Write a protein that binds this ligand. Structure first.
Ligand SMILES: *[C@@H]1O[C@H](CO)[C@@H](O[C@@H]2O[C@H](CO)[C@@H](O[C@@H]3O[C@H](CO)[C@@H](O)[C@H](O)[C@H]3NC(C)=O)[C@H](O)[C@H]2NC(C)=O)[C@H](O)[C@H]1NC(C)=O
Ligand SMILES: *[C@@H]1O[C@H](CO)[C@@H](O)[C@H](O)[C@H]1NC(C)=O
Ligand SMILES: *[C@@H]1O[C@H](CO)[C@@H](O)[C@H](O)[C@H]1NC(C)=O
Lengths: 412, 444
């Protein structure tokens, strides 16, 4: 249970729901917090479970990393007639039972939550409040989105949503479109930067780089340990969290003797006397950087949603119209010759009342062909199909010819 | 041109008493543009209903075998670099990464039907690379293909070519009937059925090419054999079974191994590939094309491909149970005719074109017959002066004959003049023959 050694204060509680301060004020190996234990269930919240040693939304809020929205959480008991549930109703979520509250990161990059009236619980889609008699509601709030938060100083005031072929994602109106509008629920990764709003992304590529800052170390201490806090006889072997702000930095001063692994000893001053706490290195921590518009940036925090996107499938798939007539067709006693413009003709076929005749030649602006059947003697109309080198030129043309005299053709 | 005396019925003044003529008829099918002729004679100056089966055209259609679809695809990649011992960056996990298996970092993708693969690459391990550990780190890449253009191409092959005859059936009192049928096949038309023998050749070999069909745009030919297994660097490297699968890059589409080129250079990953644009190849070999004297081209109606090869066939279509008669035709009609000209050749497949000026007071037909009965001329007669044409066969350089023409009335003398051109074969042994020639190229 090393994941319960939270970075920073580890305050996994929300304002108003302060009935679980025994175990939700700093989250430790001992208790059980309703607003945190859901994150560690197998198969749920996999993105945070991968980045398990980064702050949650509530933790980031309590460290002043992420601000709190204006109507911080308009209670449905007192504000069910106000335009509150606008960003919530565009998301597709799934809450478990016996939960009276649920918090999410709104569009402006702040934290807002939905609180059902007392003794009511949130339904399976977190959209309605339902009252079940004789039910014990949990004391925490369900994290709606799957996200992990960190502290950043990189500025992102010029960052904006840039998705191709999207007219509207979530509650953001990307542009104005007319015509067909494909509408569906999609999993859209997002990120929030300093002095910015939510920035939905098309591709989620990110990297982490480790460091030796205090948030990268997991200090603990045994319960009942000699010459330590809570130094009394015990009946169970359990750990206890330790604050790294006490162990002295290298070449510095501190209040508690501290020991640890190689990474801790390389940055802090590992003691030579009896140690008070063991400070290892959070094996997954570091600084996570996102790539937006090719350039890497440091987000306040990233996640993903299930919002409704209004795409545009197509304006026009393809247009195939070509009534081209840039050719001259003049029947000649020597042969059927058609003179065309710049586009060259390699092979052609001539059809006149069933019987057809074909010709092949190198690409040229003109081609001569033998007359099909008795069309030379009888004249009439003759259709010609040819293969142009270019495109957008009609391949079916018709030539009108009067009756001809074979004597000139065979004259010798 | 042939009678039906074996099963002739009594086609009461005016009223019709047709007995559903059951006797079949056997007449050799005429050449291309010619017609097949019938004699429903009743009482002189009455009846004489003519059934005409005009030979529209003969084409060497294609019998398609296997087929598949393809389009233009472009890849997109998602990367996630984690240090050693983080997640599943164990050397064994990084090396054994099964493309079919997805990493836990790109779980927002979740379940999807897009064609996709997953790769894992090692990078530097050490404080210079970015990780305190010295064992190599990992870079998980998820790549999925997406379609660029909203179009697809169908690629098929012709296992064999079949002779196919198009006939214009000029039924009794109305010529609205066109039928297309192959060799040794029957078509259940009105008044029974029509069957074609075409005993000469039911096939014209095979080939080793493949044809592209763009829906609503035309056809094309590629100079490669049709391969049922995808191959890198050829057409159909990525192939599907439907246009929807192509336009959505569905995972059911097959593709060759090692199509995506990965450049894991330390700053940014580069996911790219070199793929043959099927649209370029389609535009390159547009249909109107000639290969070793075959000249494949789009069939009339744009529903397939043809094969213009030198040859000819013998066709003997058989009518059966032909019965289409009414009672209003019992009245006689007057008609007049005037000879116009004579053009064409002799002893030739094309024949000699015969045109006649018809001046009639109403609906009717023409039954000009020569003295010996060898040559028959039939032309419909309509109100006012009309100019209709017919096609006959001759074996004389000059034509000078008289025909007993009568449009359901009295026979009057119709005289035809003119000479016929000579089809220089610059190569003759004893004769030419009519047969039924399928279209052929110049290089034959
Ligand atoms: C032998 O006489 C035939 C019968 O007149 C001619 O064959 C065709 O005659 C048609 C009408 O009798 C003509 O149709 C005309 O076509 C022109 C232009 O193509 C248009 O004005 C109309 O479609 C039509 N005009 C009408 C109905 O008044 C054909 O022009 C004609 N075919 C041709 C081109 O020969 C022959 O002309 C004639 N043979 C010889 C050797 O001259
Ligand atoms: C390393 O961290 C991952 C989560 O980031 C954890 O699953 C794994 O157990 C850790 N390795 C250890 C503790 O050896
Ligand atoms: C694909 O992966 C799944 C789970 O990762 C596995 O059950 C299945 O056997 C794999 N199929 C292969 C390797 O062909």
């Amino acid at each position: 249970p090393h994941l319960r050694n939270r970075p920073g204060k580890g305050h996994n509680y929300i304002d108003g729901m302060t009935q679980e301060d025994a175990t939700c004020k700093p989250v430790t190996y001992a208790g059980a917090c309703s607003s945190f234990d859901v994150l560690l269930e197998k198969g749920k919240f996999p993105l945070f479970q991968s980045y398990a040693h980064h702050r949650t939304l509530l933790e980031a809020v309590h460290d002043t990393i992420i601000a709190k929205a204006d109507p911080p959480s308009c209670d449905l008991q007192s504000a069910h007639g106000n335009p509150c549930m606008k960003e919530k109703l565009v998301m597709k979520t799934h809450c478990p039972n016996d939960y009276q509250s649920a918090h999410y990161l709104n569009n402006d990059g702040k934290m807002a939550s939905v609180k059902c009236p007392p003794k009511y619980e949130l339904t399976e889609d977190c959209n309605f409040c339902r009252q079940m008699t004789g039910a014990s509601l949990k004391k925490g709030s369900y994290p709606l989105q799957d996200l992990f938060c960190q502290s950043s100083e990189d500025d992102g005031s010029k960052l904006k949503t840039k998705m191709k072929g999207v007219c509207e994602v979530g509650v953001q109106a990307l542009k104005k479109c007319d015509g067909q509008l494909s509408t569906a629920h999609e999993v859209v990764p997002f990120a929030v930067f300093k002095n910015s709003k939510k920035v939905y992304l098309d591709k989620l590529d990110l990297k982490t780089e480790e460091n030796l800052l205090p948030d990268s170390f997991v200090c603990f201490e045994h319960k009942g340990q000699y010459k330590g806090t809570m130094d009394s006889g015990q009946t169970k072997r359990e750990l206890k969290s330790f604050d790294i702000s006490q162990c002295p930095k290298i070449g510095g001063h501190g209040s508690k003797k501290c020991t640890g692994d190689a990474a801790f000893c390389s940055a802090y001053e590992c003691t030579a006397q009896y140690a008070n706490a063991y400070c290892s290195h959070a094996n997954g921590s570091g600084i996570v950087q996102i790539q937006v518009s090719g350039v890497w940036k440091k987000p306040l925090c990233v996640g993903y949603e299930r919002v409704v996107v209004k795409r545009e499938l197509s304006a026009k798939p393809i247009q195939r119209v070509e009534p081209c007539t840039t050719c001259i067709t003049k029947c000649e006693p020597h042969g059927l010759v058609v003179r065309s413009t710049g586009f060259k003709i390699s092979s052609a076929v001539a059809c006149a009342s069933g019987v057809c005749v074909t010709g092949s030649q190198s690409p040229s602006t003109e081609i001569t062909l033998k007359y099909p059947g008795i069309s030379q003697s009888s004249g009439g109309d003759i259709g010609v199909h040819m293969a142009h080198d270019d495109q957008s030129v009609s391949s079916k043309i018709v030539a009108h010819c009067p009756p001809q005299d074979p004597c000139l053709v065979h004259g010798c």
